[PDB]
Each structure stands twice: as structure tokens, then as C-alpha cells.
Amino acid sequence: ESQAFQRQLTALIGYDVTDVSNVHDDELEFTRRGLVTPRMAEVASRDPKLYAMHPWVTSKPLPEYLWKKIANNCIFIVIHRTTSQTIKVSPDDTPGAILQDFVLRVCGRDEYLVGETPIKNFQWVRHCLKNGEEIHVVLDTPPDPALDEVRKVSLWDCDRKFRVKIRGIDIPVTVFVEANIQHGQQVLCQRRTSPKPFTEEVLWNVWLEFSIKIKDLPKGALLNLQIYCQLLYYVNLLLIDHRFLLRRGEYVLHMWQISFNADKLTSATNPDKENSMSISILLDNYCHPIALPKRAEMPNQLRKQLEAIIATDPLNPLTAEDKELLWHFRYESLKHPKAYPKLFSSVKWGQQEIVAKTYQLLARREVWDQSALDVGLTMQLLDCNFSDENVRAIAVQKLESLEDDDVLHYLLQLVQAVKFEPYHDSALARFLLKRGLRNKRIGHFLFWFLRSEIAQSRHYQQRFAVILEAYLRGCGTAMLHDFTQQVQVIEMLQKVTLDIKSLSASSQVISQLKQKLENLQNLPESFRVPYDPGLKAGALAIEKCKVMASKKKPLWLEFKCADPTALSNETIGIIFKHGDDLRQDMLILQILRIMESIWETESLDLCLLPYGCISTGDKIGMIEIVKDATTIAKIQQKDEVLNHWLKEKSPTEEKFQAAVERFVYSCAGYCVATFVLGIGDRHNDNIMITETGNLFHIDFGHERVPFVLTPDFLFVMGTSGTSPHFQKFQDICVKAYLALRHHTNLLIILFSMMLMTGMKEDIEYIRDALTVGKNEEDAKKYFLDQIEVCRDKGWTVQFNWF
Ligand SMILES: Cn1c(=O)n(C2CCOCC2)c2c3cc(-c4cccnc4)ccc3ncc21
DSSP: OOOHHHHHHHHHHHHHHSSSSOSSSSSSHHHHHHHHHHHHHHHHSSOHHHHHOOOBBBOOOOOOHHHTOOBBTTTTEEEEEOEEEEEEEOOOHHHHHOOOOEEEEEEEOOOOSSSSOGGGGGGGHHHHHTTTOOOOEEEEEEOOOOGOOOOOOOOGGGOOOEEEEEEEEHHHHHHEEEEEEEEEEEEEEEEEOBBBBBSSSSEEEEEEEEESSSTTTTTOOOEEEEEEEEEOEEEESSSSSSTSSBBBEEEEEOBBBBBOOOGGOOOOOOOOOOSBBBOEEEEEEEEEEEEEEEEEOOHHHHHHHHHHHSOOOTOOOOOOHHHHHHHEEEEEHTTOOHHHHHHHHHSOTTOOHHHHHHHHGGGGTHHHSSOOHHHHHHHHSSSSTHHHHHHHHHHHHHTTTSSSHHHHSSSSHHHHHGGGGGGSSOOHHHHHHHHHHOOOHHHHHHHHHHHHHHHTTTTHHHHHHHHHHHHHHHOOOHHHHHHHHHHHHHHHHHHHHHHHTOOOHHHHHHHHHHHHHHHOOHHHHHHSTTEEEEEEEEOOOOOOOOEEESOOOOOEEEEEEEEESOOOOOOEEEEEEEEEEEEHHHHHHHHHHHHHHHHHHOOOOOOOOOOOOOOOETEEEEEEEEEEEOOEHHHOOOSSHHHHHHHHOOHHHHHHHHHHHHHHHHHHHHHHHHHHHHSSSOGGGGGGTTTTSSEEEEEOOOOOOOSOOOOOHHHTTOOOOTTHHHHHHHHHHHHHHHHHTTHHHHHHHHHHHHHHHHHHHHHHTTHHTSSSSSSHHHHHHHHHHHHHHHHHTTTEEEHHHO
């Protein structure tokens, strides 16, 4: 009756929030309760007119390469209604001024040109100008905002030393327990139990007295229990709870097994109980509830020493002297926003006094607030190394400066960063709740970015599910309708992918596929595309649908577009795959999209193709089909072969000369990008190219060479084992490489988090690849040398690949 809505949300999320069986406290229920207010606040504050039409706009400057297309200076936008007419408009002209009521929707898209924004500052206008396409719009009627209607004793006096009683470890099928007090990645104090023979049950009943006191336990503290026999099981328990109270009583904790990592920081217990390892522990209880309460300059030499510490890379660890230097002169270090991550590492979190000294130091934020926004440091303070609620919130406060365009560039990386938050309700989760609820595009990607983890991560599904339910409860009836239509389709397409895979390691398979898709089309008739929400896919082209030939078996699906106002009847091609982890490809594609923005600021377009890719469920998702594209393997199935393929598929010579240029930029782009990320040693079948000349890597799901610059690519430029194109390539390569190096800290910390949340020494790769330390001229030469490593090898490495 009154519960029907929750069972609808339950099916959208893919996990039950009301079901509380793997919970030892009430944090999820308390954060479900606490999340109501920032949803109520956002639902109410959003302009219902601009919420319904979600104009995807930017406040960033129009790039160098895009002002080349505009001349007079005017742009042509063709308005449709059967009868169409072109209108010459100034780049700085508002959409209403063009209209001279009615709205300017994009043809075949739920994309609109609205608000007090210049047309040059629209993401669809910039997109068309980049791709050299016409701006086809339609004089449509604004959508009803009615469709989005939303349904409605003190701690610092407990000077006693802390202790935990290790009762034992009950397991269904030598060993010792390692008890740790943790804050960030920094272990405060360790204690082990005496080794005992490994059996079905191992009792100890011994108390482990720690060096740290109750008073000195920081908000965010963790009792991390580990089972060593060398590490085999782990579990965590927040010593300070959500209601600021120290943990008391008996706790049985089901432990996570093994095979550093974000999964190893989780406060959640293992849901499996009949097969998992447990741990009975006792925590000292009291009659009254224990509750946590709330100059000189610097000499020229010690200034230079501190300046060198700030200027180093994030991965560079601080010594004991570096930590003392930074802490003593914290008031100076506070006047340099770049020192904050390193300074907040230098503080002794296991000392109530040193913590209180930081908390009051942070009240002098006049300098941090007034600073120019840096995503680098903001992401730095949100990682595993920072467990303090206050420090993290200073980073979340800067995320408010980010306009909807930028929130989209880091939505996935911010969603992952929630894994490092000690408590469920956090400034970050709330931040992602505001931005998702304010914007429909952000909200759509939020849904899928959260649903990605809820369905595959047993470690963080609990936390993420309460954040999804909170977003869902405020998006409005329209988005809730759209998501049911997406869930219903992917859940339908999930069975088909799995049933077909359970028939192969042919005509039988291809007939059985259409035999199943037939009893599927007879709901829904339309659904938004999870990786491109503007595009609405209609009914299937069941005759075009096939099962793909590789080691894995994906579903090549083609859907007609639901919008009849579309320019072409070109179907929407979607790959539905199983057995591969799309969570890592999502992460790689995101850094690629970030790299492009870095190049945009530096006035460069390296023509990357970061194809839509959404992780949907348990090792299953969907991938965008790139139209008129094939792999290098299919083009070979040597030197001449690619340039012969480009001319052959090219209509005019004008278009071919465009095809070789689109090749040099995209090739240089994938050369710099895949090198930095360390995914350049890839097989020919994992490198694609459009009939337009647009090259792009794929299958990112986890002798040597730095990148792929084979002779067939070189022959396209006009070189065999210099050229006017190869010189243009080398120059744009360096120009692109040096741009990414200006954002070292950003890339370093983006990669670091990517590793921990998606997948110590492995991370160190970007230090060397982004040539940390070396000057602008030394890096130019270093990259040009890596070009020559590909020239020397040629077909060697490509041949080596089995
Ligand atoms: C025409 N055509 C293909 O043949 N294929 C492939 C199918 C699987 O064998 C490799 C080639 C693709 C595409 C494959 C991906 C992709 C698939 C899995 C992982 N990462 C990326 C993306 C876009 C694509 N577009 C077009 C297209």
C-alpha cells in the first residue's frame, strides 16, 4: 500500500535499503534519515523550467580551433517545423533573440537550447562545429515541469587507555589476529594475539591494551581486525560512531577474504555468513554515554626547504623531518593551498590536542577560500590518506565552484572518492546529491555510476544504495519513469547475453538470438541511452542484431531512434557484453575525456573517441558502436594497407586529405594518452579507425613498446624505415604531451584513485611517464625518443602478440 514506492526504488537500485540484516549499528537508517533535508532543499530550490529542459552549457572560453569555423563572424542554425529555414546568428546571441511560448530542441535529441547563455557557449553547438556538422534545431513546445513532480560523560575526560577483547574466530571450514587503530592509511598503533593452531573455532578471550587513550581517538578512527596465518581475512569497525559515540558492547564481524585497495577500508561486514569467517570482540561499556566534543615569520633557508616540500609530486612521501617542518610552520604553510594535502598528512591525528590545533588553524581559511579552484588538490584531500571530516569538507566546499559541465568531467572520480569517506553521510555524498538533483544529465550519470557499484561491490553496495534512494526520491516522476525503462531493458538484455554465452566457448546461435529477441519485442517501446541520455532508442532492428565472434560473446544490438524528428534513420548500435569488467573501461574513458579538456584549455584538439560505456550489473554492461569503423586487424586480414583503405572508403580527394589530418591528430592523441596511462602496448584488434580517419583504442578491461606507431600509420603520414605530416605529428605529439605535464598533480592523483577504487609500486608508473622533475625542453626530447622506440620496433611487437 504505502510501501509500493520503496519496492519500485528497490528494483531501480538493485539492492534493498529497508532490509537491514548485515548491519551492527543503524548508520544506513540514520543516513537515509539525514539525507532527506539536502534532497528537500535541492528539489525546492531548482527552477522547474530550467530543471525540465536541462540546457547543457559552458562558461569556458571558445577554443582557438573552433573560432576558425565561424566567419563574418556568424553561425548558421537551421530551424525545422516538414518546412525548414536557415538563420544567420552571431556567436554571442541568446536563444530567445533568435526566436524573436516556443523552444529550440535538437533534432532527434531530448536536448534544448535555452537560458540566458550565448549560442557559442552551448555544448551541442561546440560539438557540431568540432565535427563540421550543421546545427539542426526544431521549433518545439517546452516540456511540462508538471512531469517532474516529486512525491511527498565527555570523551576528552576518559583518560583511560583503549582496549579490545579478542574472544575468537568462528570459521565453517597456525593463525593470529592483528588489531589496528587506523585514521586515513596511517596506522596509529598495532597489537597482535599469541599464535594458535588454525581450527574451526579459535578462542583467546585476551584483552589487547593499546598505547592510545579514549580522549585521543579521532572522529573517523577504525578498529581494523586482520587474520594472518600471509594475510587472509580483514574487517573494520568505526571506533567513533555516526552519533559521535565511542563503540560499546559485543560485536560478531563477518570478514572479507583476500584474492592498497579501497575495498580494504570498508566499514561494512561480509553479507555471506554461512561461508564467511567471523570475529567475536568485546568493547568496554559505561553507565553514561561517551560523547566527543567540538606569530614569528620563517628564515630564508627554512622557507626554501618548505617550498621544495610543497612543489614535489603527491606520490612523494614525507620524512619525519618534512612532517615536523610542515607542522611547526603550519601558519605559513596555510598561505600556500598547494601544501594542504602534505600539511594535513604531517598532523598527528592520534593526539586530541594536535587535532584541535588543526581544527582552529582551519578557521583561518581566508587564504584557502579566496584561491583559484584546483581539482588536483580537491581530489587529493578526498582520497584514502585523509579520514578527517573537517579537512575533507574544505575540499568538498571548493567542489561548489564547479559548474555542471565540470561536475560531469569528474562525476565518476568523485563517486569513487566516496569509498574513502569514513561515515555514510558525508559532505561529498551530499554534494553529489545536490548536483544530481539540480541537473538531469548529472543525475542520469549519477544513477548509473552508483548502480555500477551497488551491483558489483558487496563492500560498498550498502552506502551507495542509500545515496541512490536519496537521489531517486527527488529526480521526479519523469526521470523515475525513464530509469524504469532503462532497468527493464538492461535486465531483459542481461538474460539474453548470459543464455547465449552458455551455448558457446554459428547459424544455431544467431537463429536462437533472434528467436529470443522476438519474444522480447512483443515492454518498453522507447528508452534513454545510458551512455548518451539525449538519445532515445526505440524498437529493435532484430534482423540487424547478431552475436559477435571473439573469446567472449557480446550482443551486437541495433535500435531504431524513437524520435521521428531525427536527421537520418541510422540506428543506435549497442554492444551488450559479459565476462569483462566495464568499471575499468569507464575509468579509462573518463581520464581520456579529462585529457581532452586539458588540451582544450591549452587550445588543442587531439580528436579522441571516448565511446559511451556503462557498467550496468554483475560484470555486465553496454558499449557504444562507432559507425563506419573497423579494427587494424580486419584491415590487414602491410605498410600500404591502411592508406589504401583510407582512400578506398573516401569519396572525394578533399575528404581524403581531411582523412589523413583526422588520422595524424587522433593518432598523436592516442599516442600521448595511452602512454601516460600505461596502456600503449595493445594488440591491433584493440585499435580501431573510422572511414573518416579517426583512430581509437578499445577493450580497456585490464619485447615491449611505449605506444602503437606501426609503419602502416607512418605510411599514411608518408614515411618508411622525416615527412611534412610526420613532422606535424611529432610537433603536435610534444605540444599535447607538454600540456598534460602542466596537470601532473591532477593526472597523478586521478590515476592513483582509479587504481584503488577500480582495479604502491604500480602507481609509481605515472611519475616516470609524466617525467616528474625534468624541464619542458627535456620532456620534448624524451617523448620524441619514445616515438623512435616504435619506429625501431615497427611490426616486431605487433607480430610478437601470439
Ligand atoms: C564495427 N565494430 C566492431 O567490429 N567492433 C568490435 C567488436 C568486438 O571485437 C573488436 C571490434 C566495434 C566496437 C567495439 C567496441 C568495444 C567493445 C568492447 C570493449 N571496448 C570497446 C566499441 C565500439 C565499437 N564500434 C564499432 C565496432
